[PDB]
Amino acid sequence: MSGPERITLAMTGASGAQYGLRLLDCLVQEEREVHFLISKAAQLVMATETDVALPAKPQAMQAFLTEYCGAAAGQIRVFGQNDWMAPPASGSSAPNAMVICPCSTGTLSAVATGACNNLIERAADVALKERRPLVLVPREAPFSSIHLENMLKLSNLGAVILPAAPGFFHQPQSVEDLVDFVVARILNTLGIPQDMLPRWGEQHLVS
Amino acid sequence: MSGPERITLAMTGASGAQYGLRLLDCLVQEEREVHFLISKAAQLVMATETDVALPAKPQAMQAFLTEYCGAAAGQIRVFGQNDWMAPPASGSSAPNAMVICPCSTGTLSAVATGACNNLIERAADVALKERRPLVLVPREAPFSSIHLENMLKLSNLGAVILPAAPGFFHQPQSVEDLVDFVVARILNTLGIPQDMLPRWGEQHLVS
Amino acid sequence: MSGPERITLAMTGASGAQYGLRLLDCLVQEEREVHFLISKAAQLVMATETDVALPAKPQAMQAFLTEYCGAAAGQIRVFGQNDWMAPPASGSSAPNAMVICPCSTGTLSAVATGACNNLIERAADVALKERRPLVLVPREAPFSSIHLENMLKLSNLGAVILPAAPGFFHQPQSVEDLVDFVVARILNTLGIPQDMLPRWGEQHLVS
Amino acid sequence: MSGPERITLAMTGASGAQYGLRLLDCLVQEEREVHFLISKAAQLVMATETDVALPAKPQAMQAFLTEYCGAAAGQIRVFGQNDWMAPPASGSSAPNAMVICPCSTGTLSAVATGACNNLIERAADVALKERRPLVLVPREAPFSSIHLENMLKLSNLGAVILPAAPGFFHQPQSVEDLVDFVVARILNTLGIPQDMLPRWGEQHLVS
Amino acid sequence: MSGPERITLAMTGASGAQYGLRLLDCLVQEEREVHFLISKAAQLVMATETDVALPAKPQAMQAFLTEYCGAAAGQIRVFGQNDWMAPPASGSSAPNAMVICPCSTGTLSAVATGACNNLIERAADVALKERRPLVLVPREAPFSSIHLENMLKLSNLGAVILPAAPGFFHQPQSVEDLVDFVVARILNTLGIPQDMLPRWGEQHLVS
Amino acid sequence: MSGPERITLAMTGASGAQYGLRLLDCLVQEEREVHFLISKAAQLVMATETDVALPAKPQAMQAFLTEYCGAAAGQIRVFGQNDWMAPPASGSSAPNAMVICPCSTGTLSAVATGACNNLIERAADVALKERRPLVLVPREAPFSSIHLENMLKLSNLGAVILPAAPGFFHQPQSVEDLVDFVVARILNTLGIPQDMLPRWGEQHLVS
Amino acid sequence: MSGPERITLAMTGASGAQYGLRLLDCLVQEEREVHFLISKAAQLVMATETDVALPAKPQAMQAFLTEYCGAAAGQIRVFGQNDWMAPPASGSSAPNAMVICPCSTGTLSAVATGACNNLIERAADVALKERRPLVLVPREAPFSSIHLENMLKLSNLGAVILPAAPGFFHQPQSVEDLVDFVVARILNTLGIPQDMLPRWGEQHLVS
Amino acid sequence: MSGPERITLAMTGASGAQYGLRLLDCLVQEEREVHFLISKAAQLVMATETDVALPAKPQAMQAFLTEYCGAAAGQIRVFGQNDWMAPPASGSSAPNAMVICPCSTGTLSAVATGACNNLIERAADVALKERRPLVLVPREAPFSSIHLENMLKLSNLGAVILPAAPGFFHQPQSVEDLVDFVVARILNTLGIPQDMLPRWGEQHLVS
Ligand SMILES: CC(C)=CCN1c2cc(C)c(C)cc2N(C[C@H](O)[C@H](O)[C@H](O)COP(=O)(O)O)c2[nH]c(=O)[nH]c(=O)c21
Ligand SMILES: CC(C)=CCN1c2cc(C)c(C)cc2N(C[C@H](O)[C@H](O)[C@H](O)COP(=O)(O)O)c2[nH]c(=O)[nH]c(=O)c21
Ligand SMILES: CC(C)=CCN1c2cc(C)c(C)cc2N(C[C@H](O)[C@H](O)[C@H](O)COP(=O)(O)O)c2[nH]c(=O)[nH]c(=O)c21
Ligand SMILES: CC(C)=CCN1c2cc(C)c(C)cc2N(C[C@H](O)[C@H](O)[C@H](O)COP(=O)(O)O)c2[nH]c(=O)[nH]c(=O)c21
Ligand SMILES: CC(C)=CCN1c2cc(C)c(C)cc2N(C[C@H](O)[C@H](O)[C@H](O)COP(=O)(O)O)c2[nH]c(=O)[nH]c(=O)c21
Ligand SMILES: CC(C)=CCN1c2cc(C)c(C)cc2N(C[C@H](O)[C@H](O)[C@H](O)COP(=O)(O)O)c2[nH]c(=O)[nH]c(=O)c21
Ligand SMILES: CC(C)=CCN1c2cc(C)c(C)cc2N(C[C@H](O)[C@H](O)[C@H](O)COP(=O)(O)O)c2[nH]c(=O)[nH]c(=O)c21
Ligand SMILES: CC(C)=CCN1c2cc(C)c(C)cc2N(C[C@H](O)[C@H](O)[C@H](O)COP(=O)(O)O)c2[nH]c(=O)[nH]c(=O)c21
Ligand code: NA
Ligand code: NA
Ligand code: NA
Ligand code: NA
Ligand code: NA
Ligand code: NA
Ligand code: NA
Ligand code: NA
């Protein structure tokens, strides 16, 4: 298998819940183990932007997402926001890649400053210290200098700042096509196969 | 009238030609004068991503866009990439707001470093020196530290970095809705009326 | 009318509750719409430093402040600390000026780092990204280098750092005179008329 | 009326007394109130470079300049270098735009470092703290790194650094034409009408 | 005795002459030796804000302050602004703590840049080089980035930046109470006993 | 002979073609060898601002300038913008001093960032690496922070930033006098004799 | 002759008047022209540390120093602290090397920040902009970070920071030997012959 | 007793062996315990500049210095350059103040960069980490930017940079007087009594 066996997928409270749900679906279909984290604010975004009725508590949420995605038993773990006994909280855990999608400006701030106030922020702190993959998918416009400084600091360390800024070069025909563009870029970053976005120029040879 | 009477609208070679065309259409409908600039690479993006058959040379291009947008004679000026006799090239011109939409990473670089190699880059240099509005709409993912440093430098000076990162909080149903989200944010930044994106919470009063 | 029609007034937990209440009163008397936010810690400061019996929950609080200030129905909105549906949470809202008065060192930190952990901090983040007025009124002494760096970062972006440091050059005779000095400076910053602090030297002509 | 009703015009001891006198004349003709300040060194520059016989003390100086410019009684205030009772010394004064023309390297230094050693330097410090317009017109060549760092710091804060570097693109025929070029740029910066320098390209439409 | 036997107390030309006079009175009552310095501008502030008729020259001033404060002969030294033979001018003097109260923005600048243009600024330069206490009490609002950078530089070196920003948490009933708050904080910084501001929470034990 | 035997004189597209032509004339009269470079944009400035009919191609241009200046055969070399076989392109060439007069903001940018996109920019890069004289004569107003940072970087390395900011202290009577002021300063920087601007104070002895 | 024909020698108010007088004597004996400047504070240092009875005003001072040093008529110019008509005030003057010996911490500050408040500070500003030699001889201990930052900034530009820190490696037997050590180093820096300090190791050949 | 009971005195290879020997003598006379360290290069400086015949190895050296200074048995410890079992090598040792006198540029570098290559450099590293006094007495001229950056870094941390730059304000009559000036300043920094340099201005009272 190419790419990580396990991904920590954190959803935080930026607009674009569709991106995180699509990414979750794609990771499940690629037979990956997902350690799923979601902030309080992200639950309110999901309720506002989608007709996904996500249960609030981790055990109900795990059962719901397992069904929603057609996952295997055990494939989606869900951990609460203060569950320090979960793998992502320690660098002595088995290695995971981590994606924060969507990434609110507040979570971006916390990761850049090392705040570690909940399991998402601690998980990202652990990824950075252990040199494990960390991809942040912010959705905001305009970006202020506060945002940009935080992104720059993290990019300089080795985090991938991948804004939810879909391209139009494969003639998207629906909202789903644009969502799939960004999810494809995340999967490409992680080194996980995807067939939503072709390999640009693969067949080109000269000119 | 609220907002600027004249806007310099530059299209450069990032994916998202739809954004610049929609913005042009909205500015024309708000009875604004538009000084329209387009890079060579942007012409190739437009041909690839749209079925707009934009003529190559400025006089033909002006006539085409005037018809396309239903503009008045004289309302859309078009200037070539080396036309230093055009208003945007000097700070002694009448004041315009300037928008680069889409903004390629190369144009972002040129603006940040002061390269002034064509009329778009000179126009932005003039906006910055004269303290006139400058809005940059980059479309790229991931953003590297090179991109982020360039954006941060310009944001710190007072340019608005407004990534083509549409929100989903008004339940978009088409690609056009997502395009209209970003265009609405640009128009809000410029202080020009728009009725595509409601005023969040305007009717909320308590809780 | 000169100055903003709407002001977001946030009270946080620094000593000087009197300043925020006086400012609220003056804004109401100038027929402005106020979007009123208050932190948990600020409620404890108000109870300690004043004999204002402010109710805890937003609907009761709105009714109380409306009476206290002699405001019109609808003139003072009150929003809770997690109410993301309120206007200040999105830059797509109608434009407001924002004042944090008093501004605790912790709120100053959150604004400088982009933490966005409650509606006050998100509101300030939105003001900065949208280039809308932001005035911070810290009350602390000494100021440490941590405080000063945070203030400097925000001042460099364009926020107004206006310490609760009243002047004595108009011969204050009471605590109220000193409070009114700082409130007058805030109103002057916002461009809202005030007749508490004369225009220095207005009548001077030579020497 | 477009632009500020009141301008603080400070003349300091760089070569180019002609620029400050021309600017004063233009501001008077646009019916603006001018708060006029002049350094000791600037008085020696004026005596060396012009045949203007400027009296030394503020009351005589005010009467002289009023006649010289054809100003109304009261239109030109003159204030001495230690007159802290004058409006420019306090941010509680009515708002003025401020221009230092010419701006010596020593005054540029004082403004950049916050020295406030006389009314000119205090006035500029007040402009910066209150976010009121500040335009500096240095005349020096070469510029050393000391000069450039001081200019950069102030430009980054929002001051306009407008060197006395006239352009030749409207075919100047006399020294007066070159002086009028720089004065026109200052007036354009302030948003005050001027008919000395046309609006570049205003009549251009295509090519 | 706790705290320094000798204090250099410099008054400069910020609003808040009351603070410096109160501090002087408290230091005298604690049987400390005070080396008293005052700027020209501070003499004009004192005349404007108080009904203290301070004589201009050092010998008359010393006699006046000795009476005003009920000091012992010799307890208050007064030194002129160019008296380099006074103790504060050399680091080979006996150690003193130094307080600049109030501290103008111009004196803050001079101390931060090392200007040493009069005995106050030299005295502060000496305190910094000898690692002796230096407390600066600025009174300004807003603080610009120039002010903040100067404060930050000095705080980073070890100076105490203590703005004249009184707290309200001990229910002040008069202007004097607010003055006494700031003076108490200065005395606490210096390690000199004071009974104006209680020790917060001293009697609290749990909760 | 005092000063360099050979000067690389580059004209770029800032306003002030008169300065470069005057400098060329003076260098020829001082019997110096000039390696003459001119940008495309500078040719359009010269055509706009002067009645010099400069041929476009290097061989015609060399013959024209030789006649215009009364130069010796071989004294003025002219090299095209991509002629990497010309001496200025390599640091193994015989040493020349280099002057860019006028220096556009775009050429200033290219030199500061090391862009080397044509022979002028490469020539300046070579001067900096070889520690050979480099004088830049910018003509712009206002200068933005982008401009100022670029100038500061180059000044810190050892380039001379000499803005086209003529002085008035020798009572100029014509445009030519002002042009001659700046050209004299350039020649003084290079250490080449000039008799247009006297040696200030040379005859002064005391007071 | 090796080394500069003319030296601007400025004495400022640091301890070590002996160094400046010795240097003056050596420059006169090497048949150099000296443009002599002295601060008010330096006159008080000279009176305190030496039995040189230096007259206060420039014409008397010039006559006195001419006799004291055995100089030729005209060899020592003396200029007052506000004499802007003296050569050192303009970069269009004939080139001089400049030495500030001793250099007070306040003059070091002024030079580093570009204050130009008197002819000494302006002269140094001119040296830096024109790339002419500038040697600063500070005498202070300890050096604070303020001092060190100012020295570092100037050293980075190309000024020579030469502390009055004599060496003992040629077995000094008197105060005069130690003074002569520092003066020899200054003369070596300037490239002026001196026979007080031998060339270290000149005769050594191997080991 | 005022001041530290124990001082680590390190002599390194700058010119000025006299300073370290005098300081050693004064510390012994004040009944302090001295932990004495000396570099190889310092032994060669001492042999070159003095007629002190210092034995090479630590036990002989200790006996020699004990006699030379009239110290008590045990009062002067001497430790070798690799003796990690000596107290200064660990922060768990009893607290000492540390002085490096003279301080070579190489030892200054090592301390600034944390090199810890011998016991002197380790001892200084320990002083900095434990927040114990560290005084560096460099002797070099000119100081390069390398030197100055190293000094600035250490001063910013809290080390005292005290150059061997004696003052002349107490009319020194011999080399010994100048040596005693610097040693007095060191002792004052350490808080150890000295009667070589009076307390400036102690008896002054007014003017
Ligand atoms: C339309 C509004 C109010 C904003 C657009 N969007 C968003 C949509 C919706 C519908 C809600 C409710 C909230 C947001 N927010 C704000 C955000 O959740 C908060 O700052 C919050 O503190 C984040 O906390 P976490 O980092 O998740 O712990 C948020 N934050 C952000 O960074 N980007 C966004 O797109 C948006
Ligand atoms: C699918 C490819 C190859 C990239 C996506 N997209 C894009 C789409 C298409 C279809 C074309 C052709 C080109 C791009 N580029 C590259 C870009 O135009 C160039 O770097 C170019 O030099 C820009 O020059 P200008 O600044 O306009 O003068 C470009 N640049 C960028 O910054 N963002 C983009 O989205 C893309
Ligand atoms: C006398 C005490 C304990 C401090 C003076 N004052 C204050 C008065 C009172 C009476 C209370 C209770 C609290 C304060 N604080 C502390 C402060 O509220 C907290 O740090 C807190 O976390 C702030 O959270 P928010 O930013 O409001 O969300 C606070 N914080 C601050 O920045 N400035 C202040 O003046 C004071
Ligand atoms: C030909 C000389 C000596 C210089 C050219 N010019 C000038 C002309 C004349 C004829 C005089 C007399 C003085 C100058 N100066 C120097 C200047 O006034 C001083 O540095 C001075 O301290 C400035 O103090 P202020 O900031 O006004 O309080 C000055 N300063 C500057 O920054 N630019 C200039 O053009 C010149
Ligand atoms: C109401 C005015 C004009 C200002 C409020 N206040 C003040 C009050 C009064 C009544 C006077 C007269 C002056 C001030 N100033 C200005 C100040 O004294 C000057 O900048 C001055 O150069 C300072 O020099 P020093 O550092 O003392 O040598 C000053 N400066 C400052 O930093 N803070 C202040 O509060 C005020
Ligand atoms: C009146 C206008 C449009 C501007 C004033 N002036 C100027 C005059 C004329 C009449 C022309 C045509 C052009 C300018 N420019 C713009 C400039 O040439 C361009 O940015 C250009 O890309 C420079 O490229 P190069 O560096 O030479 O390769 C330019 N650039 C600059 O830095 N300073 C100037 O004074 C002006
Ligand atoms: C024993 C005292 C009070 C200090 C030692 N020495 C000195 C000696 C004597 C005997 C006098 C009188 C003055 C000093 N000073 C202080 C100094 O002159 C002042 O800061 C002053 O403002 C300098 O202004 P300038 O830069 O000359 O315009 C001064 N300044 C300095 O930087 N180094 C010194 O060695 C000393
Ligand atoms: C006259 C010479 C060659 C220099 C003056 N002086 C000195 C005098 C004598 C007579 C000797 C032999 C050596 C010096 N040095 C050089 C110095 O010892 C070395 O760089 C050396 O590596 C220092 O190593 P440490 O840090 O002690 O381990 C040295 N280093 C320094 O920083 N300042 C000095 O004054 C001098
Ligand atoms: Na949460
Ligand atoms: Na192009
Ligand atoms: Na709260
Ligand atoms: Na003056
Ligand atoms: Na004074
Ligand atoms: Na070209
Ligand atoms: Na002086
Ligand atoms: Na050694």
From Swiss-Prot, chains A, B, C, D, E, F, G, H:
It comes from the Bacteria. It catalyses: dimethylallyl phosphate + FMNH2 = prenylated FMNH2 + phosphate. Keywords: Flavoprotein, FMN, Prenyltransferase, Transferase. Its EC number is 2.5.1.129. FMN binds at G13, A14, S15, S39, S104, T105, G106, T107, C116, R139. Pfam families: Flavoprotein. Dimethylallyl phosphate binds at F169, R185. GO terms for molecular function: carboxy-lyase activity; flavin prenyltransferase activity; prenyltransferase activity. Coiled coil: none annotated. NCBIfam families: PRK06029.1, ubiX_pad. This is Flavin prenyltransferase UbiX. It comes from Pseudomonas aeruginosa (strain ATCC 15692 / DSM 22644 / CIP 104116 / JCM 14847 / LMG 12228 / 1C / PRS 101 / PAO1).
